[PDB]
Structure 1
Amino acid sequence: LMPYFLLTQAVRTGNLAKFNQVLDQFGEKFQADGTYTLIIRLRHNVIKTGVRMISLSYSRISLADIAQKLQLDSPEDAEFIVAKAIRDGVIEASINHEKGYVQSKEMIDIYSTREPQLAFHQRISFCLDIHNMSVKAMRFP
């Protein structure tokens, strides 16, 4: 996990050369585990992960600023990346071809207080299977 730790740091930072070097150093075990194709996929999706984190960080971030932050050095590539993030639906960052506007959040609506209970009311379903297991497992002799 020490190279994995450095991989996590590289994912957060957005740099390329440092983790490419450590993959060339200790990437054989990754190949043995069978994730090296994924390893390269993370190596080139580091920018995607950085875009999500910086989009969660900022309200209206400049496309030039995000390109400088994640080593794109290209306004068009930055616009394409944020386009690709929004179409994937991972983040809510939108595009305004004027300067790169992104909408902010809003106060809580009808379903925003109800989606926890809707996704969590399986508690009684767990209770009923526990009770049914007890019914199965209360042999007296």
Structure 2
Amino acid sequence: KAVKLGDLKKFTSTITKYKQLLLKDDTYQLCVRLRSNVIKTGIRIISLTYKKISLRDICLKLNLDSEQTVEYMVSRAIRDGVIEAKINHEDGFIETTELLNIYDSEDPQQVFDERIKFANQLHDEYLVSMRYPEDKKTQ
């Protein structure tokens, strides 16, 4: 509910509320992080959808939040990838990438390979169990 927005306070509020329950499950250690992650998540979304947005309009989300920590905060975000964009403050333009391809790459065929690698899952397993009646029926 918070993480949908990842609204640090509203976020924290839950924690603020449930910390003991968190503490009860010691999931408390978590989320302390995803705080700005979702913040950075939002930052990525319905936002990077220009080849940029500006410094300040993307800083606007930080003008919503902070300033020139933006630099960090964006680098903080860019650091992880988890978004793909660039900037130049010299430009003051927070330059928000495509993320656009096709399956020209082996990327699908990776998954195919992934699928391929699985081709042995049930296939090789069928032999894994072929035994049991077949072999015990001999008995």
Alignment TM-score, normalising by the size of structure 2: 0.71
Alignment partner, residue 135 of structure 1:
127
90-99 or 114-123: which moved more?
114-123
Q: 1 or 2 for the larger relative contact order (CA 8 Å, sep ≥6)?
A: 2
Alignment partner, residue 95 of structure 2:
102
* Deviation of the 1:116 alpha carbon: 0.8
Note closer, same or farther for the CA distance 1:56–1:39 as it changes in structure 2 (3 Å cut): same
- Unaligned 5+ segments in structure 1 are none
| Number of residue pairs matched by the alignment | 130
- Identical aligned residues as a percent: 40
Equivalent residue in structure 1 for 2:3, among 1, 4, 8: 8
Alignment partner, residue 83 of structure 2:
91
Note closer, same or farther for the CA distance 1:55–1:134 as it changes in structure 2 (3 Å cut): same
Name the Cα RMSD after superposition. Answer: 2.7
* Residue aligned with 1:95, SS: strand
Query: Quick check: 2:48–2:97 contact (8 Å CA) kept in 1?
Result: no
- Unaligned 5+ segments in structure 2 are none
Is 1:49 aligned to 2:51, yes or no? no
Alignment partner, residue 123 of structure 1:
115
Rg: which structure is higher?
2
